[PDB]
Design a protein around this nucleic acid. Structure first.
Ligand SMILES: C[C@H]1COc2c(N3CCN(C)CC3)c(F)cc3c(=O)c(C(=O)O)cn1c23
Ligand SMILES: [Mg+2]
Ligand SMILES: [Mg+2]
Lengths: 479, 546
DNA sequence: AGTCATTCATG
DNA sequence: CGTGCAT
């Protein structure tokens, strides 16, 4: 009927249970592919369903429902909001979901509910899933024990640094900003060649974050500090021009703001400064951003000290903010503050992946080569093979007779005996061409397996392709 | 001659009239035995026969609302019967005689046989005529309830009922305290049976009282072994005794705040029985349904108000708790005239249960699957505020917290009485997931920080099967092996939720017990406190990532 | 189809 | 205060 437990014990089996899960399976990105579980499931499920960049948009609610019923046992709001975020190009440096309809704005207005919008994976998101069908990554059973899901994606580009992550669990939080794809890939490529590379040298390739929202990042040494330790405070400041209006008045024009800042709240707080006259000078605040351009006009009064006003806004609004690195990711099942262990785990991961992919393709190529070898043989001996099957009592007896009389293996016997009659109309040469192409294919793969360097070259070759395909810096760097 | 205006003698009906002359005959034969076994029988015929252990015609006389050959001129049954056969065994012979319709004698009273010595006994069997009666079908259920409730005050007598149609039977005998049990048989019980005896100048009053979780009060009264269906001065003496004896008990070392009535009678059931000397006996008009005799009010109020000012002082358990109940009754009552969570139907802080359920959704199934008599439902909507991290300002401005502080009814903090509570068990019912774990954690810390006594008196609990025949352990499924795996209660129907986790017969509740206050205080304050580093380390040290 | 509030960590 | 998965 009733069993006692201590207050001290209850709060222990519970908070441990929760803590472990929120850290491993909710708030924190995997260090290799840079995804939280909800995002990986989103991408995996839409890809399983062929809802890719090259096909028609599919209703958001259909996608969300499948994710919920197959992989992610939580609310649809959370899944949908997560899916929507991965589509907002002012939050993601390289968006992974393309969404048709109101998916929000820099002003932070609610996205349309998932009954209105429609979505599909972006082309680049395709590269996170590249080769997932090739047994390249470890799979587990879903919540449901009905279906397998991937525990990490193949990640043909370094999404952790490219898109970023944030980041609140139990005992740990994470803030990793976005970086330029070409830059991050240049760094990875250097490190592949020079594994013991030092930060100073890596920063010749990867000078610092690259926000989708652009702006100005100030703090070379804190950037360095963060690349070494995973923690660091940098300054992020709006791009600003001044315009000399008629009649001796000036006007400050903002055109890029700090990452994660709500444009509309910022505009209101700057106008609050004007309405309250905390500092003198501001004539009018005017948000002039249209569908193709961000532009805020802070018109000044005649004989207004524009440097004073600007500086004050920089300090007392989010016209300028501090951005704090707190690079935490999940490495070998546990939370790590990390650059060296991060990159190295990733590199070891790609190694396992590429090795596994190659075993898989080689296996396929061999099974085939083995059959093609049997068929080449069969042709030297058709008339008597048809005779033999003619004399067999049934399928199983026919296979047996093919093994016993002509040494075919089971697998070859199965193939031979399940051929359609029309095949008997058919040339050993075509087959020999195939036999040769398979042998070459197997040699390439077997090398990769027996020798690491061939594999790392492939990985660099593929990362460079991704870079060539997917843009220039947005955020300027300043000492 | 009574045949002509039958309602006057009986109040004819269908068949309340038919069931009225049987009352008359039975009460008559009782009255006769009083001055030791009456047996009634419904026959296959349809006829009814009352017999008992010149007794004869003093017996067949009826219209008989009392207790405490010769005639046969106006036996109101004889007049109202198809035939009526009558038989007496007396002195050493047995005599029979029967009549038809009006009561015109079909034969003379003759000796129809030899009787076993001087042994005496009287018997009347009759069939009402279907002329003056519209229903001739005696109901055994009704006759039963009569004979039953009759036999309580009739200590001298035992009476039986046999239905030869349905071949069933009872018998009744009672050696006023039992009556309150009989009255509260299938009900739940706030106080035990209180019994107060006493003589006081001629009058003999004898009362038992016993509260239930019910609402309607239920007070029966008896003067001189018969019922005063309409109450009377003795009743007013009894009611006026409690409302003023308990008010005193409140006023004194209890609770009154200085500066109620029928609120004391909510769920009160009581059987009250006085003996009046008959020369002082006076009722209202025509019928002896309402005692009017003035002295009865201050003698019953005497005897009762005395004994239970003693009883109340005698044990502050069933006492101050009982008063509080009156004020909860006083509270909503005046809040109904001011009307011009899902609560348990009846208020019983001794068996009542409060269910804090994670989510309005699960809250729904809880409301539907519950036993509404003693189980209340409180849906918590969202994660509960962390009562360690937040300020006692914001903590008290929280809906989930604020309404538990109210629904529980004991206040909070050091201004907190565990006796003004509302439940014997507060039960936390969450999802069997990680977030349910989290929720249990935030509620436990609130109850510890702000209602420690409730957790200290082992009042706080925590409520499902893992497998489907059901099993909870990985071991219990292998014993069944000689399979569906439950992912949530949502895969829960109200039916299943009950059988499995809410039913006090088929459920398992972990009972929170504050064992080592000091190492318990370290645990809450480290897991839920403002400081992150302690927690992080507790996790790093105790949490097996692998 | 918006709106309301709460956890968790951090500067 | 605001962030984003959770309730
Ligand atoms: C689980 C429920 C709990 O209640 C919720 C809210 N309230 C909490 C109680 N408050 C007194 C009133 C507001 C809320 F404001 C927002 C949400 C919400 O966005 C949400 C979701 O599924 O996305 C789900 N829920 C919400
Ligand atoms: Mg929501
Ligand atoms: Mg749940």
């Amino acid at each position: 009927n009733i069993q006692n437990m201590s207050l001290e014990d209850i709060m222990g089996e519970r908070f441990g249970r929760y803590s472990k899960y929120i850290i491993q399976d909710r708030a924190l990105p995997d260090i290799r592919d840079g995804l939280k579980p909800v995002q990986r499931r989103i991408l995996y499920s839409m890809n399983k369903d062929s809802n890719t960049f090259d096909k028609s948009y599919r209703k958001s609610a259909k996608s969300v429902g499948n994710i919920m019923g197959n992989f992610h046992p939580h609310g649809d709001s959370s899944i949908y909001d997560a899916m929507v975020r991965m589509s907002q190009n002012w939050k993601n440096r390289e968006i992974l979901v393309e969404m048709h309809g109101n998916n929000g704005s820099m002003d932070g207005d609610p996205p349309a509910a998932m009954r209105y919008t429609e979505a599909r994976l972006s082309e680049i998101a395709g590269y996170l899933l590249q080769d997932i069908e090739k047994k390249t990554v470890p799979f587990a059973w879903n919540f449901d024990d009905t279906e397998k899901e991937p525990t990490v994606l193949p990640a043909a580009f370094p999404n952790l640094l490219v898109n970023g992550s944030t980041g609140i669990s139990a005992g740990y939080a994470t803030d990793i900003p976005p970086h330029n794809l070409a830059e991050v890939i240049d760094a990875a490529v250097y490190m592949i060649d020079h594994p013991t590379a030092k930060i100073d040298k890596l920063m010749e390739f990867l000078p610092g974050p690259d926000f989708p929202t652009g702006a100005i990042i100030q703090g070379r040494d804190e950037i360095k500090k963060a690349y070494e330790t995973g923690k660091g405070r940098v300054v992020v400041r709006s791009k600003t021009e001044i315009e000399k209006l008629k009649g001796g008045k000036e006007q400050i024009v903002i055109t890029e703001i700090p990452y994660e800042i709500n444009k509309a709240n910022l505009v209101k707080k700057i106008d609050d400064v004007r309405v309250n006259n905390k500092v003198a000078g501001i004539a009018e605040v005017r948000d002039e951003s249209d569908r193709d351009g961000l532009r805020i006009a802070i018109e000044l009064k005649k004989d207004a000290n524009t440097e004073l006003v600007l500086n004050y806004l920089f300090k007392y609004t989010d016209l300028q903010i501090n951005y704090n690195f707190n690079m935490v990711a999940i490495d070998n099942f546990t939370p790590r503050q990390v650059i060296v262990p991060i990159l190295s785990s990733y590199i070891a991961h790609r190694r396992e992946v590429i090795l596994a992919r190659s075993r898989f393709d080689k296996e396929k190529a061999e099974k085939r080569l083995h059959i093609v070898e049997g068929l080449i043989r069969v042709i030297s001996i058709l008339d008597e093979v048809i005779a033999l099957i003619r004399a067999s009592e049934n399928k199983a007896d026919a296979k047996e007779n093919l093994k016993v009389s002509y040494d075919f293996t089971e697998e070859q016997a199965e193939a031979i005996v399940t051929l359609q009659l029309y095949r008997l109309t058919n040339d050993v040469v075509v087959l020999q061409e195939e036999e040769a192409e398979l042998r070459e294919k197997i040699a390439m793969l077997a090398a990769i397996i027996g020798d690491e360097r061939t594999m790392y070259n492939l990985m660099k070759k593929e990362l460079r392709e991704v870079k060539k395909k997917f843009t220039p810096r947005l955020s300027s760097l300043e000492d | 001659a009574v045949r002509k205006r039958p309602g006057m003698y009986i109040g004819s009906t269908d068949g309340a009239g038919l069931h009225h002359l049987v009352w008359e005959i039975v009460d008559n034969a009782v009255d006769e035995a009083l001055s030791d076994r009456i047996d009634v029988t419904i026959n296959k015929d349809g006829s009814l026969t009352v017999q008992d252990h010149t007794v004869e015609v003093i017996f067949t006389i009826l219209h008989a609302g009392g207790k405490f050959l010769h005639g046969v001129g106006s036996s109101v049954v004889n007049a109202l019967s198809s035939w009526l056969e009558v038989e007496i065994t007396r002195d050493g012979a047995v005599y029979k005689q029967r009549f038809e319709n009006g009561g015109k004698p079909v034969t003379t009273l003759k000796k129809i046989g030899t009787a076993p010595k001087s042994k005496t006994g009287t018997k009347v069997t009759f069939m009402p005529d279907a002329t003056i009666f519209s229903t001739t079908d005696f109901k055994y259920n009704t006759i039963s309830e009569r004979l039953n409730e009759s036999a309580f005050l009739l200590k001298n007598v035992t009476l039986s009922l046999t239905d030869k149609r349905t071949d069933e039977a009872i018998e009744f005998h009672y050696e006023v305290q039992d009556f309150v049990s009989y009255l509260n048989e299938d009900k739940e019980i706030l106080t035990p049976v209180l019994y107060f005896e006493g003589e006081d100048n001629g009058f003999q009053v004898e009362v038992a009282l016993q509260y239930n979780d019910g609402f309607s009060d239920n007070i029966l009264s008896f003067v001189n072994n018969v019922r005063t269906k309409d109450g009377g001065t003795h009743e007013t003496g009894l009611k006026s005794a409690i409302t003023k004896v308990m008010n005193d008990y409140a006023r004194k070392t209890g609770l009154l705040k200085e500066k109620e009535g029928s609120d004391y009678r909510e769920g009160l059931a009581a059987v009250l029985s006085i003996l009046v000397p008959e020369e002082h006996l006076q009722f209202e008009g025509q019928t002896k349904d309402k005692l009017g005799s003035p002295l009865a009010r201050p003698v019953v109020d005497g005897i009762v108000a005395d004994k239970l000012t003693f009883f109340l002082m005698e044990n502050g358990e069933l006492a101050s708790n009982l008063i509080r109940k009156a004020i909860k009754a006083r509270d909503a009552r005046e809040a109904a005239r001011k009307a011009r969570l899902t609560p348990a139907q009846s208020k019983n802080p001794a068996k009542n249960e409060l269910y804090l359920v994670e989510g309005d959704s699960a809250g729904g199934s809880a409301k539907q699957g519950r036993d509404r008599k003693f189980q209340a439902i409180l849906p918590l909507r969202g994660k509960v505020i962390n009562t360690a991290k937040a300020k006692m300002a914001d903590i008290l401005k929280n809906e989930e917290i604020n309404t538990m502080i109210y629904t529980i009814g004991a206040g909070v903090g050091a201004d907190f009485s565990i006796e003004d509570a509302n439940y014997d068990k507060i039960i936390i019912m969450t999802d069997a997931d990680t977030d349910g774990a989290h929720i249990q954690t935030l509620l436990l810390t609130f109850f510890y920080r702000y209602m420690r006594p409730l957790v200290e008196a082992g009042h706080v609990y925590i409520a499902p099967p893992l497998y489907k025949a059901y099993a909870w352990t990985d071991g219990e499924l292998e014993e069944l092996r000689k399979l569906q795996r439950y992912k949530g209660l949502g895969e829960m129907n109200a039916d299943q939720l009950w059988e499995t986790t809410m039913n006090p017969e088929t459920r398992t509740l972990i009972r929170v017990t504050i064992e080592d206050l000091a190492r318990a205080e370290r645990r809450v304050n480290v897991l839920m406190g403002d400081k992150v580093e302690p927690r992080r380390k507790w996790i790093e040290d105790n949490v097996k990532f692998t």
